[PDB]
Structure 1
Amino acid sequence: AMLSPEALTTAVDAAQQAIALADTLDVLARVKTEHLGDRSPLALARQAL
């Protein structure tokens, strides 16, 4: 199982950093697809059904 407490924490850190680095709304839609969509690493944590 690849869902250690140090795995989800680092994945969110890369997500919140890219979300905070989103300067315009068009970049936020790109970051949302890479960190909150159905293909994001956090989605893979939920893809592991």
Structure 2
Amino acid sequence: AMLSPEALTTAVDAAQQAIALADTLDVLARVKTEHLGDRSPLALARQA
């Protein structure tokens, strides 16, 4: 099982950092697809 507490924290810390570096709404939409869509790292985690 690859859902350790430091595994999800590695994804959230990388997601919130990219969200913090989103300066326009178009960039945020691209970040949303990579960190909250059905192909995000959290997606493969929640799919298991």
User: Which TM class, normalised by the smaller chain length?
Assistant: over 0.9
The answer for unaligned runs of 5 or more in structure 1 is none
How far did 1:24 drift? 0.1
The answer for unaligned runs of 5 or more in structure 2 is none
- Deviations 1:1-49 (CA, angstroms, capped at 9, x unpaired): 000000000100000000000000000000000000000000111111x
Scaled by the length of structure 2, the TM-score of the pair is 0.97
Whether 2:34 is the aligned partner of 1:34: answer yes
For the aligned residue pairs, the C-alpha RMSD in angstroms reads: 0.4
User: Which 4+ stretches in 1 moved above 2 angstroms?
Assistant: none
Query: Distance between the aligned counterparts of 1:44 and 1:22, measured in 2?
Result: 23
Q: How many residues align?
A: 48
**Percent of counterpart pairs with the same letter?**
100
